[PDB]
Each structure stands twice: as C-alpha cells, then as structure tokens.
C-alpha cells in the first residue's frame, strides 16, 4: 500500500509524534505540573490489614457467659460463650497507556516515567471514591455511605456547634467515639464562622484544621457537597493491599479496546507500538456498620 499518512485511532488514546494535518512534533517542551499528587484518604484514616490472599477471615467474641448466685449445696447452673465471623475480599484497579514508538523516541522519552505517579494518584482517588462515597462503580458491597444509608444515621441542618455536637453524640449513642472528620474543602468557609455563644471560643481551628479537637481530612471529589460532613470511628475501617502498584511495559501484545481506522484491533508488534499497563489490588472492609454518621444540609 505504501500509505504514509499517520494511523488514526478510535478512541484517540494513542500518543503520536505526527498529527493528521502533517505537523511533526520535534522540540517538545516537557509539560510541568501545577499540582501536588493527592494521597489516598482511606489509606490515611483507616487501619492497614496484612492480607496474603485475595480473601481474609476475622472472628470476634459475641456472647459472654452469665453467672449465678447458688445456695450452699445447690446445683451450679451452666453458661456459654459465642463467637461471630466476618470476611473481606480484594479487587483489581488497572489502566493501559498506548504509545507510538516514534512518539516514545522523538518527542517524550520520559513519558512512562512521568505517568507512573499520575497513575498512582488515579488509583488512590478511585479507591477513595469507591470506599467512602460508594461512587465510581464501587466493586465492594461495602462502604461508609452505604453503612450510613442502612443505619439512617444522618443529621439534617446547618453547620452549628449544636449540630456538630449532636453529630458526634450520634456515635456514642452506640458506645463509639468519633476519631476524625471528612469534609469538602469548600466548606471550611462555613466552619470558620461558627462560635460558641457561652464560652466564646470557635469550634474550628483555622490554623490546625482541627474541628472540635479532631483532625479534619479534605476530599477532592466533586460528589461530596459543600454542606455535607461525615464523621466516624475510622479505626473501624479496615483496608488491605494484596498487590501494590505493578507496572509492565509491552511491545508485542494486542490491544482490543483500541481499534484502527479500518476497525482492526491494534497490534503492538506489527504496528510498532508500546503500551504501559498498571494494576493494583485493594480490599475494603467495614468492621462495624454503626461506627459512621453524616450531617447533611436540609
């Protein structure tokens, strides 16, 4: 055929050194990042749990024996212990970045360096939005928002010391104590302008980002609205990581999720392409569905 125009891809996910208008992209100035990569908020708040396989078993005492008064020479009555079991399973995060080898040579050699951190950020954010907010096709049948929904442990109303105290009280109503707050950075404006009328001290430390003495963690997600606040005994949120982020780069596979202009799948060898695969295994478990409560605007 000797068709020298560049290969069109659908979707347009392939990095290329030549544009279909004939522009050739030498002398490329490597992009710079106007941001700091976000940490996993679940890895921050929750409790790590060693996990060798894709599954984990927990067992806890449930019932404790009673005891009896007995008269002299009377028969001593019996009693019994009981236990309960729980379990957690892992799921897989992954993404593939395809690159044309001309691009990989004559434009941006460091590309499969610079992407690895942005990939890790994407994984962390996916994980957090699944486990905290039950968003992004949460694979686990478990989440904070879902525990809150089953318990209906929600307070309605404005950010006030009244409602914030009531929110925390909602946990000790089940003999649990709040350990931290999850909030949307948009709302520290509201927290900054609430004060106790009696002691005349403000509940939120603008300097230390502490609410009622507890640490506040900010979500970047757009799903959590300004007026919404979440709290819980995060030591009851258990996470495990059976396989840390693995990267593999391949120069010969087939990609089926990318098609050529004629509709044929992209073959990395025959077409002279390279692609980077990232995968991670993450497991989430709510140890006690009652340990979380939410404040929502009316």
């Amino acid at each position: 055929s000797n068709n020298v125009k560049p290969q069109v891809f659908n979707p347009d996910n392939v990095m290329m050194h030549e544009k279909k208008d004939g522009t050739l992209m030498n002398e490329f100035t490597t992009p710079i990042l106007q941001e700091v990569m976000e940490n996993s908020k679940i890895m921050q708040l929750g409790k790590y749990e060693p996990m060798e396989g894709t599954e984990k078993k927990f067992t806890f005492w449930a019932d404790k024996p009673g005891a009896y008064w007995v008269g002299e020479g009377q028969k001593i009555e019996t009693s019994k212990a009981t236990w309960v079991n729980a379990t957690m399973r892992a799921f897989k995060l992954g993404v593939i970045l395809p690159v044309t080898k001309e691009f990989l040579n004559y434009t941006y050699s460091q590309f499969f360096e610079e992407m690895k951190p942005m990939i890790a950020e994407a994984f962390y954010k996916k994980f957090d939005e699944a486990g905290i907010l039950n968003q992004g096709n949460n694979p686990f049948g478990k989440s904070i928002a879902q525990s809150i929904e089953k318990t209906n442990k929600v307070i309605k109303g404005d950010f006030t010391q009244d409602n914030i105290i009531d929110l925390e009280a909602l946990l000790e109503d089940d003999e649990l104590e709040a350990n931290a707050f999850i909030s949307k950075t948009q709302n520290r404006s509201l927290l900054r302008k609430i004060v106790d009328p009696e002691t005349k001290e403000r509940i939120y430390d603008r300097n230390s980002d502490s609410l009622d003495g507890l640490p506040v963690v900010n979500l970047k997600s757009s799903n959590l609205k300004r007026g919404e606040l979440i709290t819980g005994d995060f030591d009851k949120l258990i996470y495990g990581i059976p396989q840390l982020i693995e990267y593999k780069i391949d120069e010969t596979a087939q990609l089926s999720t990318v098609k050529n202009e004629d509709g044929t799948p992209v073959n990395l060898f025959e077409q002279d392409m390279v692609a980077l695969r990232a995968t991670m295994h993450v497991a989430l478990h709510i140890a006690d569905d009652k340990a979380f409560a939410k404040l929502v605007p009316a």
Binding site: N39, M43, Q44, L45, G46, K47, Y48
Partner: protein
C-alpha cells in the same frame, strides 16, 4: 518515634503510619553531638550484604 542522625546532631520526631509518616518535631527535638561525622556505622557480611 524517629531519631535522625546527622553529622552535627540528632533530631527527634514523632509520626504515625495513619497520617502518612508526617514527621513532627518532638519537644526539644534537636540535640547536638560532638563528633564531626554521622555516628552510626554499618557493617557488611559480603559485597551483597546477604545472610
């Protein structure tokens, strides 16, 4: 609890895994030492440091 040894002194910090190992200086964090090089020494079983 974390101790960091430099060529001029020991710095003491506190951390926890949950906050991401953010080092916070301990009360009276710094402590001078009179050597002129980092005091800890390492020994090696062989070139590869294998048991």
């Amino acid at each position: 609890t974390v101790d960091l040894f430099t060529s001029h002194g020991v710095y003491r910090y506190l951390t926890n895994r949950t906050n991401g190992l953010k080092l916070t200086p301990r009360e009276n964090s710094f402590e001078s030492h009179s050597f002129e090089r980092m005091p800890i020494t390492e020994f090696s079983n062989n070139e590869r440091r294998k048991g």
